[PDB]
Amino acid sequence: DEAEASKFVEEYDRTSQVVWNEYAEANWNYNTNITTETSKILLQKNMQIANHTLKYGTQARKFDVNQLQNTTIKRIIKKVQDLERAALPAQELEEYNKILLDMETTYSVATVCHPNGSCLQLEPDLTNVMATSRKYEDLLWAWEGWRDKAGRAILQFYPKYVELINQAARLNGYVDAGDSWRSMYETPSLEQDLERLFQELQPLYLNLHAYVRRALHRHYGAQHINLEGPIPAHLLGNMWAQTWSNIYDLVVPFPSAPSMDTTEAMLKQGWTPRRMFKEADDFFTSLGLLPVPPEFWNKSMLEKPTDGREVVCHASAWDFYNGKDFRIKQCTTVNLEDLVVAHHEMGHIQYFMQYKDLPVALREGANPGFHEAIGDVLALSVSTPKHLHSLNLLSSDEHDINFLMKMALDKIAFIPFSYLVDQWRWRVFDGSITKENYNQEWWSLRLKYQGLCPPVPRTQGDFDPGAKFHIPSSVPYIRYFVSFIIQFQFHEALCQAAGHTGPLHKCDIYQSKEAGQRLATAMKLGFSRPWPEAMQLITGQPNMSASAMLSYFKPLLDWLRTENELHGEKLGWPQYNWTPN
Numbered sequence: 001d002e003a004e005a006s007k008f009v010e011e012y013d014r015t016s017q018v019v020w021n022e023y024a025e026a027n028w029n030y031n032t033n034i035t036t037e038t039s040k041i042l043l044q045k046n047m048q049i050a051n052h053t054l055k056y057g058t059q060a061r062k063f064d065v066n067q068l069q070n071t072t073i074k075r076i077i078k079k080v081q082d083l084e085r086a087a088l089p090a091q092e093l094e095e096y097n098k099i100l101l102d103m104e105t106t107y108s109v110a111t112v113c114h115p116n117g118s119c120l121q122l123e124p125d126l127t128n129v130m131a132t133s134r135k136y137e138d139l140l141w142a143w144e145g146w147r148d149k150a151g152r153a154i155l156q157f158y159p160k161y162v163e164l165i166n167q168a169a170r171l172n173g174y175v176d177a178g179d180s181w182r183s184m185y186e187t188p189s190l191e192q193d194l195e196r197l198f199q200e201l202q203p204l205y206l207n208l209h210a211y212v213r214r215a216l217h218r219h220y221g222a223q224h225i226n227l228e229g230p231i232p233a234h235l236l237g238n239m240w241a242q243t244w245s246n247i248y249d250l251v252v253p254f255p256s257a258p259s260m261d262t263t264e265a266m267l268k269q270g271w272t273p274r275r276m277f278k279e280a281d282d283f284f285t286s287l288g289l290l291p292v293p294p295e296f297w298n299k300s301m302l303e304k305p306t307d308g309r310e311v312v313c314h315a316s317a318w319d320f321y322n323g324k325d326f327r328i329k330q331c332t333t334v335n336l337e338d339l340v341v342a343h344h345e346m347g348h349i350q351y352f353m354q355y356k357d358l359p360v361a362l363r364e365g366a367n368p369g370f371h372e373a374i375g376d377v378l379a380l381s382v383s384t385p386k387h388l389h390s391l392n393l394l395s396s397d398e399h400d401i402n403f404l405m406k407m408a409l410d411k412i413a414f415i416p417f418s419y420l421v422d423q424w425r426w427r428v429f430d431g432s433i434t435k436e437n438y439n440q441e442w443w444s445l446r447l448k449y450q451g452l453c454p455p456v457p458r459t460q461g462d463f464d465p466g467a468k469f470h471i472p473s474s475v476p477y478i479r480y481f482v483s484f485i486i487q488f489q490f491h492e493a494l495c496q497a498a499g500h501t502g503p504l505h506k507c508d509i510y511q512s513k514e515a516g517q518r519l520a521t522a523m524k525l526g527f528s529r530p531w532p533e534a535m536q537l538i539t540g541q542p543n544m545s546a547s548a549m550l551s552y553f554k555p556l557l558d559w560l561r562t563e564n565e566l567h568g569e570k571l572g573w574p575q576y577n578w579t580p581n
């Protein structure tokens with residue numbers, strides 16, 4: 001029984017390489033060239049990969065996993081028994097694939113237009129407005145417009161999507177799609193684990209929220225900001241108020257210690273998207289990690305085409321299942337934000353290259369959070385004033401608190417957002433949230449976790465979750481919450497491995513071969529072992545922990561508490577029922 005099992009795995013892995021490589025090609029071709037033709041080829045390749053999955057999945061289910069000796073074979077066969085969407089009947093499957101395509105296409109081609117003439121796309125036009133405008137009504141136009149055009153358009157598809165993804169989940173042995181998604185972590189205590197981590201970051205978030213709220217009150221006026229209520233969702237510098245770094249200039253702790261305009265610096269010095277990815281490549285190689293192949297530079301789409309082409313702009317990293325072909329697809333803007341994004345995506349590429357010699361079933365991160373965390377770890381060092389000054393993008397305790405605030409606006413603000421997205425989706429999937437209250441429940445969570453309110457009352461027909469990429473694209477989100485916790489654990493451990501002393505936020509692991517080695521050994525494991533092993537290899541312990549993130553921001557927590565107390569802030573939003581009058 002063991003001999004037939006390993007033979008099966010061998011056959012599965014060699015055939016999967018071929019069909020998945022074919023599928024990836026067609027998917028890439030659509031993502032980088034949205035047309036009726038590339039659509040039809042993709043949907044046809046969807047049938048082909050479903051045929052393969054069904055064939056091998058059906059075989060896999062005939063194995064009694066319980067009777068298998070080898071644990072690696074056991075692990076692979078167990079995973080192949082999950083057919084995903086391929087479990088659906090033929091008619092259901094073609095409908096599901098069409099629904100996903102329609103949702104993705106709708107989101108990626110959505111535009112917000114001025115009556116007079118000009119039509120804005122999310123990247124870069126609406127993103128730029130949200131980042132730079134300091135005018136209440138202009139931010140409102142972009143915020144509401146995006147939700148009116150992208151969000152509302154997704155609503156027609158979503159209930160059927162939910163029905164089909166849940167049906168597929170049940171046919172694969174889960175109770176619903178959220179159950180299926182959570183299972184990717186192989187952690188029965190996941191929901192409690194994440195709840196505890198969220199709670200530990202409360203003091204930091206609430207203090208940041210209160211301080212930022214006070215600064216908004218100062219700029220946007222007392223009539224538009226309730227100092228005891230939620231913050232209007234359009235004022236945080238980001239379409240989804242998920243990260244707040246673009247309003248740094250409104251909240252800077254010590255304006256007497258000014259920072260160099262990084263965007264202006266990058267543009268004047270002739271940075272290009274290509275150069276940004278080259279700098280990311282250099283950072284990885286400085287650690288002794290792998291360079292991207294020449295093929296990467298030849299085949300990647302690192303900027304929005306002027307080709308006339310319609311594309312999916314949202315940054316992604318692609319593994320073509322042949323151990324040679326790895327690509328990034330990103331509509332890169334020349335700014336600091338996208339330089340960080342470039343590092344993030346390059347971390348995904350590094351992961352692909354590190355586990356390329358494993359059987360494809362195990363060519364995944366230790367858990368999806370790990371995959372998201374790699375690039376972010378390096379980006380933490382990239383972001384240090386020391387490293388930015390070395391890149392000629394920047395030029396005391398004041399600057400120190402300023403830096404920590406800047407980092408908090410990104411990292412701390414994202415904690416509740418990244419937590420809530422799948423809190424909402426899991427309840428959609430399990431039936432707790434029906435289509436009659438999709439939006440109402442979304443805003444309940446936006447209030448409960450983030451302390452945000454919508455600037456304009458929502459109406460029936462609104463589907464604000466549809467205005468966030470991962471919703472119509474069916475991309476799980478809890479990975480980003482996990483990523484943000486564990487990236488600081490990795491940072492702390494790699495900094496210690498690099499022999500750095502002093503405050504964690506001052507550490508820069510550039511050129512540390514000891515740091516590179518720890519990351520490499522963990523990444524090489526792919527999905528071959530439960531994630532605590534990869535955690536152990538990097539950090540010397542097996543748990544997720546908020547401690548490293550708390551240690552990193554400790555000096556900011558102290559300053560924020562002092563600042564908030566002297567201004568008499570009431571932390572939180574006890575008047576949670578407050579909305580803009």
Ligand SMILES: *[C@@H]1O[C@H](CO[C@@H]2O[C@@H](C)[C@@H](O)[C@@H](O)[C@@H]2O)[C@@H](O[C@@H]2O[C@H](CO)[C@@H](O[C@@H]3O[C@H](CO)[C@@H](O)[C@H](O)[C@@H]3O)[C@H](O)[C@H]2NC(C)=O)[C@H](O)[C@H]1NC(C)=O
Pocket residue numbers: 006007009010070071072073358359528
């Ligand atoms: C359980 O089975 C796994 C996997 O076995 C492999 O895949 C099967 C489908 C069959 O085709 C097998 O013939 C095949 O070995 C075993 O894990 C494997 O162990 C070997 C030996 O330790 C690893 O080989 C190493 O590979 C590196 C890089 O190529 C070399 O530098 C090393 O010197 C060494 O040869 C191999 O990588 C590893 N494979 C995986 C996927 O982990 C495992 O040993 C076995 N368990 C037991 C208890 O027997």
Ligand SMILES: CC[C@H](C)[C@H](NC(C)=O)C(=O)N[C@@H](Cc1ccc(O)cc1)C(=O)N[C@@H](Cc1ccc(O)cc1)P(=O)(O)O
Pocket residue numbers: 027314315316317318319320344345348363364365368371372473475
């Ligand atoms: C259609 C192929 C996918 C685009 C790709 N998968 C492969 C095998 O290439 C993939 O899942 N890539 C992940 C990063 C990631 C990669 C592998 C993982 O196991 C987990 C995450 C990725 O690019 N995520 C991005 C978001 C995204 C995720 C999935 C998508 O289909 C499109 C976009 P990011 O979080 O960097 O902004």
Ligand SMILES: *[C@@H]1O[C@H](CO)[C@@H](O)[C@H](O)[C@H]1NC(C)=O
Pocket residue numbers: 033035036037038307
């Ligand atoms: C875009 O798609 C069309 C078919 O729809 C194809 O002929 C064309 O070559 C594609 N463009 C590029 C740049 O590949």
Ligand SMILES: [Cl-]
Pocket residue numbers: 240464465467
């Ligand atoms: Cl929203």
Ligand SMILES: [Cl-]
Pocket residue numbers: 184368369476477478479
């Ligand atoms: Cl996930």
Ligand SMILES: [Zn+2]
Pocket residue numbers: 344345348371372
């Ligand atoms: Zn990512």
